[PDB]
Amino acid sequence: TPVWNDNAHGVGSVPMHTDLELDFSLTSSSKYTYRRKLTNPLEEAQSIDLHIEIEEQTIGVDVHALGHWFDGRLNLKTSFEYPWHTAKCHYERDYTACGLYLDQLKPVGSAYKIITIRYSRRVCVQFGEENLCKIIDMNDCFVSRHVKVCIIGTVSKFSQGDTLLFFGPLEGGGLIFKHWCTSTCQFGDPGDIMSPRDKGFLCPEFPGSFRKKICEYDGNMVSGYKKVMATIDSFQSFNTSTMHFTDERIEWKDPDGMLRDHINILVTKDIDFDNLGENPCKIGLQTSSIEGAWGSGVGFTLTCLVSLTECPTFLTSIKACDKAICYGAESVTLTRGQNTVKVSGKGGHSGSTFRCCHGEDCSQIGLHAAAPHL
Amino acid sequence: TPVWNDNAHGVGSVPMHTDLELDFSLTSSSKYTYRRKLTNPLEEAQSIDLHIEIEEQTIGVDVHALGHWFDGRLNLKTSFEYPWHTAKCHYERDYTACGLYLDQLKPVGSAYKIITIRYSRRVCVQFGEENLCKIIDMNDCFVSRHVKVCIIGTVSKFSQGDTLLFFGPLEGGGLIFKHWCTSTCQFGDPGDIMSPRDKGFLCPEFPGSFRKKICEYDGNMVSGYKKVMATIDSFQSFNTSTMHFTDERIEWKDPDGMLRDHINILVTKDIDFDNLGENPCKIGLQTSSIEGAWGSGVGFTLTCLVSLTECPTFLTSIKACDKAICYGAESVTLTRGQNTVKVSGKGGHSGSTFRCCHGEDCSQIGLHAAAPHL
Amino acid sequence: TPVWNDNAHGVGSVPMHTDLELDFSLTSSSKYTYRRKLTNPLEEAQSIDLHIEIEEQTIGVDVHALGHWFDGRLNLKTSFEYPWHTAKCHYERDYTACGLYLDQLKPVGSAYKIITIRYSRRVCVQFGEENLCKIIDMNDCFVSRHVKVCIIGTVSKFSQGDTLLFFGPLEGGGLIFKHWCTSTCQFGDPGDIMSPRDKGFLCPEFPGSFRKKICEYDGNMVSGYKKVMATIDSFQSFNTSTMHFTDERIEWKDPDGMLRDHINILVTKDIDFDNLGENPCKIGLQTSSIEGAWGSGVGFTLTCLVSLTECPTFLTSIKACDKAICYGAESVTLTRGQNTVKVSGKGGHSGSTFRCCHGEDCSQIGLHAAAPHL
Ligand SMILES: *[C@@H]1O[C@H](CO[C@H]2O[C@@H](C)[C@@H](O)[C@@H](O)[C@@H]2O)[C@@H](O[C@@H]2O[C@H](CO)[C@@H](O)[C@H](O)[C@H]2NC(C)=O)[C@H](O)[C@H]1NC(C)=O
Ligand SMILES: *[C@@H]1O[C@H](CO[C@H]2O[C@@H](C)[C@@H](O)[C@@H](O)[C@@H]2O)[C@@H](O[C@@H]2O[C@H](CO)[C@@H](O)[C@H](O)[C@H]2NC(C)=O)[C@H](O)[C@H]1NC(C)=O
Ligand SMILES: *[C@@H]1O[C@H](CO[C@H]2O[C@@H](C)[C@@H](O)[C@@H](O)[C@@H]2O)[C@@H](O[C@@H]2O[C@H](CO)[C@@H](O)[C@H](O)[C@H]2NC(C)=O)[C@H](O)[C@H]1NC(C)=O
Ligand SMILES: [K+]
Ligand SMILES: [K+]
Ligand SMILES: [K+]
Ligand code: NA
């Protein structure tokens, strides 16, 4: 007969036994503070200090670092071992030999492929001498005995698969590219000339033809960087503040003040809220195996061994997390005893050890995923 | 003076005459159950059984089935009726004849073009001996005399125009392509070699040049499938559960437990809610004509003859539906007597008979739309 | 100790001291009207007229007008000053001279690049003899002493960077293109042949090769318009109603009745709401400088000189606006005295004079931004 479930983040309330509601649309890039002494109607001398602090919206993007994009010049030469044999990016016809090669290479920016986008606000609530701070994801709720804070919002600026380009120390801003070349890179494309890491170019294709007249090449001669700069107003910029780059992840606060989200704060002073996720179930967790990759839009799968006690069944979520960042979650009805739960995730880096987690509790160790693009 | 309107799905309430509110963020891939005996404060012995069941979020995607994508090898031959004349996909130069043809063809997956995306949850509410189940679309509300259930959410995983690729019996997962070739398919593109149905290839272009030295071809020689596999981590996977393929439609439950939506449940025990859509207007419906296409991003238009009685005017919505799936809706202020209402829709298949509908009531017959891509 | 903040648009309420709540999901393309006499329980003879009018959802899109897209025929000629020298779009090989040129040109539609998308509803509230109308952006709130109206919604039909094509006097509808050519336009692409203004073509590239046999060209010979028409069902249409084109901006009401948003209306009859943005701070504004461009996805930056009095600090937003349309906003904690605030914006046209604004108050003059695509 019991069907415990903690996937509901929120409360049951009696609207007559609720004392305060704050409901408002808040500038995404703004913090908010509320302070009030909660006093009895007139029939006491007891007051409770309420102090709520909501921080500015933060974006967290799991990415794959693509390395640097380059500008360069396409040069044509004739040989009748070719002179341009040392050039990393080249193309030749063997009739008299005609040759193309890239030179005057210069990095113009750092590119990042978006894997996951998540927005959040840090929310701190003091009620009496209770003090609790939590990072609340957009469309999730802060839940406590006396205070509920729900954030509801939508943003459509960034999409998975977008490529972000930063031209300089671009704590400041960047460009969004929706068509960065991937499976086919031709000279002239956004992303045409890349260096994924320190050394080594991924060279673009040269789709045109040679003619042996003095060699000629009848394909495009203009680099992707120059073609993009020539129509730069066609592309979308974004701005950033307090950037935080870590391996395969970027966090910042978008200073775009045109964006808003919705905040609802409900307070009960005397009788506790009914926490809709309340349960007596107890969970133990360890990792079993992993497969798949970090830094990948295809992702990984973490297998967890999950022990349930004190309940016959428990509907809940098991997460793949590391250092308080979660990369995936699986909703599951656990049965008493041992359970095997597979969690699909995306993101992380080579040093990530993905742990099996429930709520704020995690396994003692995690597992590494494989590298992408091998 | 009267201005009846049923486009508002919700209730007017007096916050003092409301007995229970549930407000929470729910894992999209999780169900939720609430059971409670509603009892009088202390001054009676009468109790009402409240039982709410909210099912896991379902996605319904109206699609155009594109057929199978193929891998293949590009072969080059010389003829001085060509040997490769039986090859379906070929390219030749007539000087000595040089020829390209695709062979070693193999289907690698099934592709589907997204036309419409809609999310929903089935919601069942028992209040006393009243029992009602409804499929509630995201950002719509369940309305009854004593209980309101509103679902508010946003998802940004899929977009109209995306192409979904399933590699095997991919009850399991698939890939999202945002640049599947349409108006120009060149060999090497995602989607380059397609077979729309049983037999018959839509062949890709071969943009390169021949040279008569022994023939040479200086264009790309690598299939789209191989180019995509070589950078597979650049593409976004998704997972599925309890898939349901029907003609030009796919439904499933996304097991991504990182996604949440918002649920609000309001209960009044004694006095009924004010149903904001309440009205005495009566509607009769029949189809008149149709034009446009199923399986098409451009869509169709259903013309309806709509009779209004018992009201001078009625602001409402007329829908194009078949078998309890709706494909389009037009908001309209009807006038007493006959009205002509055009409803723009998208989706459906060759067997669809699009009916004119109001609320849960539909015309006796529907009309077929035309096929796309003729 | 004081920390005034007006970035919160909403109210604090005591759920016992609230008299009416309307909560509902409303068809986006529908208006809504609520009329009620607010009367005392039984212990008075005083009534307040409540009258709420919510208008249909409007979309406002800041765009860059791209001019007209053309259909045309690619012709091949041989010359052994070339005949086709007057043709604006041409390509030649100088061996006998082979030539390509476009002719039979015809405009097929007008194209617009999406820079910004915003949805809104005009909301009018009469409470007693108080009457106030405001345009409320989606995910913002109408706030008054006795009535709060919040709109919460999400739409995923249009995206920044999409190109909208209108084929005729397309008050009626249009097509969405997600891959309109920008940095590389080749003959055959959507957007291949453009005329940005009255005269002057931006000609596409012809990536193929000539051969001197009688000249031959082995590249694509089919215009982008014809290639798109041949697979028109692959593209997404949209419909429009009551269109309003102005320079670099389009407004309309989307008649898609499948879309909904959420409306919440809270009314207190006696005691005023606590306006969460209430403050004694006073602001004076003038422009200082501007840089950047209108009609550009990169945008502009307006520098404002902002004087704060009556408060030590004030957390607020400074906006860049002209004629009651706002193009950007910066959240900022002002300090008493003079402040310099930079506001990033996008949109507008050559005649726009971007002003520094706070709430409904603006500077006496604004500044012009520079033209894009120079
Ligand atoms: C969720 O999807 C993953 C991803 O694997 C699928 O990806 C699709 C894009 C498509 O290519 C499909 O063919 C492929 O299976 C599933 O994980 C995979 O499962 C297979 C079968 O056991 C393994 O061979 C793969 O190594 C494995 N990959 C990863 C990264 O784990 C997964 O099974 C599926 N379901 C769940 C519940 O996660
Ligand atoms: C809503 O749009 C449809 C779609 O037709 C338009 O599609 C645009 C993409 C663009 O190509 C435009 O030129 C085109 O008209 C309209 O339906 C069309 O109406 C015309 C005129 O009567 C007919 O010739 C078409 O057959 C018809 N097509 C379909 C599929 O019905 C429609 O009129 C418009 N308005 C409403 C209220 O639906
Ligand atoms: C917000 O971003 C703008 C845009 O400028 C940036 O755009 C990125 C896409 C990238 O190219 C980056 O290199 C570039 O700086 C910033 O405005 C720019 O600031 C620089 C430095 O002072 C000026 O040289 C530019 O003229 C100026 N451009 C515009 C349009 O104003 C801006 O500084 C940044 N921060 C804020 C708070 O707005
Ligand atoms: K080549
Ligand atoms: K060719
Ligand atoms: K060429
Ligand atoms: Na060529």
Side-chain angles (χ1 to χ4, degrees), chain B residues 5 7 9-13 15-16 115 139 148 154 160 178-179 183-184 205 209 296-298 329 346 373, chain C residues 18-25 27 29-31 154 179 209 218 227 231 233-237 257-258 260:
Chain B
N5 184 347
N7 280 325
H9 296 176
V11 302
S13 59
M16 332 149 173
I115 297 174
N139 304 318
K148 174 171 66 73
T154 179
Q160 296 170 286
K178 299 191 69 72
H179 309 90
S183 54
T184 294
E205 301 170 6
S209 301
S296 165
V298 173
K346 299 190 197 308
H373 294 289
Chain C
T18 62
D19 302 271
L20 184 70
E21 184 177 21
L22 309 181
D23 190 85
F24 57 101
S25 165
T27 307
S29 52
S30 183
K31 62 176 203 165
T154 179
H179 309 90
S209 301
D218 65 12
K227 285 175 141 290
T231 191
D233 295 299
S234 298
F235 303 93
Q236 275 279 324
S237 70
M258 300 294 285
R260 310 183 77 82

Side-chain angles (χ1 to χ4, degrees), chain C residues 31-50:
Chain C
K31 62 176 203 165
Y32 177 75
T33 302
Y34 191 82
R35 272 186 171 281
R36 186 170 186 153
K37 304 254 174 195
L38 307 185
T39 55
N40 267 81
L42 219 306
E43 274 61 60
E44 254 313 317
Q46 44 190 15
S47 63
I48 308 173
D49 289 336
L50 175 70

Side-chain angles (χ1 to χ4, degrees), chain C residues 79-90:
Chain C
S79 165
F80 83 132
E81 200 184 25
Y82 318 152
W84 55 78
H85 81 262
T86 61
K88 301 298 187 184
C89 300
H90 63 84

Side-chain angles (χ1 to χ4, degrees), chain A residues 8-15 18 141 148 150 264 266 273-277, chain B residues 18-25 32-36 38 50-54 125 147-151 262-268 273, chain C residues 23:
Chain A
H9 296 176
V11 302
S13 59
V14 174
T18 62
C141 298
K148 174 171 66 73
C150 287
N264 185 269
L266 191 66
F273 282 137
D274 185 17
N275 184 329
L276 297 178
Chain B
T18 62
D19 302 271
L20 184 70
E21 184 177 21
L22 309 181
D23 190 85
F24 57 101
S25 165
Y32 177 75
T33 302
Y34 191 82
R35 272 186 171 281
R36 186 170 186 153
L38 307 185
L50 175 70
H51 181 207
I52 296 165
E53 298 280 1
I54 298 168
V125 178
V147 184
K148 174 171 66 73
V149 183
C150 287
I151 307 170
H262 191 82
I263 307 295
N264 185 269
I265 297 169
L266 191 66
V267 174
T268 173
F273 282 137
Chain C
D23 190 85

